[PDB]
Ligand binder design. Sequence first.
Ligand code: FAD
Ligand code: COI
Ligand code: MN
Length: 454
Amino acid sequence: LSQDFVEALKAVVGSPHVSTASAVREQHGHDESMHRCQPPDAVVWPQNVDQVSRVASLCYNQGVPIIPFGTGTGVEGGVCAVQGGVCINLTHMDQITELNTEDFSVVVEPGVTRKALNTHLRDSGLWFPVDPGADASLCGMAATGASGTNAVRYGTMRDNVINLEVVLPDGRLLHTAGRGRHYRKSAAGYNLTGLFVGSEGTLGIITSTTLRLHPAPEATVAATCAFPSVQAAVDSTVQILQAAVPVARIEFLDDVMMDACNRHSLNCPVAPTLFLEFHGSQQTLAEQLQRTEAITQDNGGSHFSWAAEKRNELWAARHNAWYAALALSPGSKAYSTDVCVPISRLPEILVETKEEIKASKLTGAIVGHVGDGNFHCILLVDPDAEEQRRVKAFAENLGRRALALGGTCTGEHGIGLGKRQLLQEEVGPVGVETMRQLKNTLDPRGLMNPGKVL
Ligand SMILES: Cc1cc2nc3c(=O)[nH]c(=O)nc-3n(C[C@H](O)[C@H](O)[C@H](O)COP(=O)(O)OP(=O)(O)OC[C@H]3O[C@@H](n4cnc5c(N)ncnc54)[C@H](O)[C@@H]3O)c2cc1C
Ligand SMILES: CC(C)CC(=O)C(=O)O
Ligand SMILES: [Mn+2]
């Protein structure tokens, strides 16, 4: 970056909001993944959408790559500046607006996290359910297509994003469903909102998200259930889903993960475990609990260990599983897998994954959203090239096994830098070309987060 170009950026956002300092660039050059690249050439903090547009236009027309940056909690290298350029940190736009409690909807800017929104909504009787473990930007969650523990009942970001405000790569402003619009369903034209959910910053910059809100449950019960084997826990999960029990949360931890979480938080029996949560009235809960206990008992599950204080720490421990695993070997980093398969194939692939972790000399823990047919294998790495190549090979083989079972290589984390070859295998040549044609019409010069997804 030329001094002329830096001065032009400063003319848009203000001198304090542009930095070319190495330490600041390095802090914005990575996420929570093990990937690393040269850092961006500058970091810029726009203060409003007009500034986002003008920064994008300046970069685009000068041939400078743009890297959108929310809270930097992604795990696939989405913010890594593989071709340099300008990192646009969006978190100074942090306002909640257009709260429509009667319509179950709200508009948030990129600096708003789920915790901030739900704190704003205290006493409204409403909440936002999609819950990554990290304190992530809600617009970043829209960009990655995030889900979480509550998605089995309340949906993913794709289910709960009603509208998006997007600055396109050349600076034009798009409201994907129309400015100010919010509604339960539409057949009007092509659905542009779904195209930008899960686009990971490669099609434009999300500067606001319109979110579906949900009623707070009448009553809540959480519990844990320990099992003799991974097979028994995952068989119970599949049978709970096939019985159509509307569980609010159903999270699997293997024995390694449960021990890690105990040590980093809980004193649950070290065994493959389900964390469960149920929502309803006193009267629906009793029914759901009886039917779910009947199924878990059939598969060797323990009596439910029941859990505001204790369920809050139960789910905080789950949400920090990433850090619990890293803490097993301080100094390590980690890669996470994220496959999602048809639920009837989930027992095969989890049990196979457990066996393969046992047979390898990698250290790995298993956790995740099995109600969705989804799970994470957390593989620790010495930041040891041969161990790194074994971890990459393990993750590729697990991805390809998921694809062989009719599934997908990522249920929620995205593609970033790590899964680009798996995506090509997953959708094939016509799928790849079609995605690339979409990328090219919105980003002709290829400057919108280059090197990611495709
Ligand atoms: C402990 C922990 C637990 C997690 N649990 C989950 C989980 O349960 N489910 C899940 O889905 N993820 C989970 N994540 C991953 C991560 O939190 C999500 O992917 C989240 O959506 C990333 O948001 P972010 O703003 O931090 O992303 P960043 O890392 O800042 O960016 C991620 C990608 O999105 C792009 N991007 C970010 N903001 C925008 C924007 N406003 N407009 C356009 N593109 C943008 C970036 O360019 C990049 O490609 C977890 C992460 C951690 C560390
Ligand atoms: C921490 C992530 C790598 C795994 C995840 O998404 C989760 O904890 O559910
Ligand atoms: Mn997850």
